[PDB]
């Protein structure tokens, strides 16, 4: 018999993104080639099958630095990290291949699905 | 020119609640009288003006235990913690006074607003 506040989940994500932009309570650095991205482990886990697996590992759960596979493109990762914290995906002709490859590696099934759809249309 | 995934924020919150239920990456215990509640500091901050203030404090940000005011009712807190992680509020005749008082203390303005509305109707 609960009532529900429609905008609650969006408002929570908006505040988590504000914490990220201000580097508040970030507990991990994701290294992608020469580039570094600060984030919250819980948000990464909630969005990605790969980070979910990494941070549930009894040894990796305690690491403050995670290095991604050298094939991963920093821009593709940046676009996906922004999507995790906003629900908004900056999908463009020039980045779609790098975004799909990064989403497949990160195990972000809904992003992979829209990339496959957008590629098929062109 | 971004695209948006409508269910993303809700799916993120659902996964954060799954992490909470399994006690994964919880980093704080909230003590309410004899009762203890494990949670994620970032989720508490995103939902509550009080926790936002506590965990942005340069000293309190590092505490693993937070003790609430002894007037706070553990059931009212439990109902509000559930709302934080689900968007669902278990508001009932028998708990509405304790829920409103706890939401005022936690600075959860939208919960305070619906409690004031539901009380006014009766």
């Amino acid at each position: 018999s609960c009532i529900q506040f429609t905008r609650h989940a969006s408002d929570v994500l908006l505040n988590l993104n504000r914490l990220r932009s201000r580097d508040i309570l970030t507990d991990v650095v994701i290294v992608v080639s020469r580039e570094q991205f600060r984030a919250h482990k819980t948000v990464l886990m909630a969005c990605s099958g790969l980070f979910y697996s990494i941070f549930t590992d009894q040894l990796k759960c305690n690491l403050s630095v995670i290095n991604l596979d050298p094939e991963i493109n920093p821009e593709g990762f940046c676009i996906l990290l922004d999507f995790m914290y906003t629900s908004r995906l900056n999908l463009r002709e020039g980045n779609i291949m790098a975004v799909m490859a990064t989403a497949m590696y990160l195990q972000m099934e809904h992003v992979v699905d829209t990339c496959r759809k957008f590629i098929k249309a062109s | 020119s971004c695209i948006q995934f409508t269910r993303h924020a809700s799916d993120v919150l659902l996964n954060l609640n799954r992490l909470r239920s399994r006690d994964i990456l919880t980093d704080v215990v909230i003590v309410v009288s004899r009762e203890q509640f494990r949670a994620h500091k970032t989720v508490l901050m995103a939902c509550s003006g009080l926790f936002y203030s506590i965990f942005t404090d340069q000293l309190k940000c590092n505490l693993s235990v937070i003790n609430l005011d002894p007037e706070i009712n553990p059931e009212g807190f439990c109902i509000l913690l559930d709302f934080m992680y689900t968007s669902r509020l278990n508001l009932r005749e028998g708990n509405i006074m304790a829920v409103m008082a706890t939401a005022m203390y936690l600075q959860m303005e939208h919960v305070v607003d619906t409690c004031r509305k539901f009380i006014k109707a009766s």
């Binding site: 609960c2 009532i3 529900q4 506040f5 429609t6 | 669902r88 509020l89 619906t114």
Partner: peptide, 4 residues
Amino acid sequence: WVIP
């Protein structure tokens, strides 16, 4: 607020 809604009835979910």
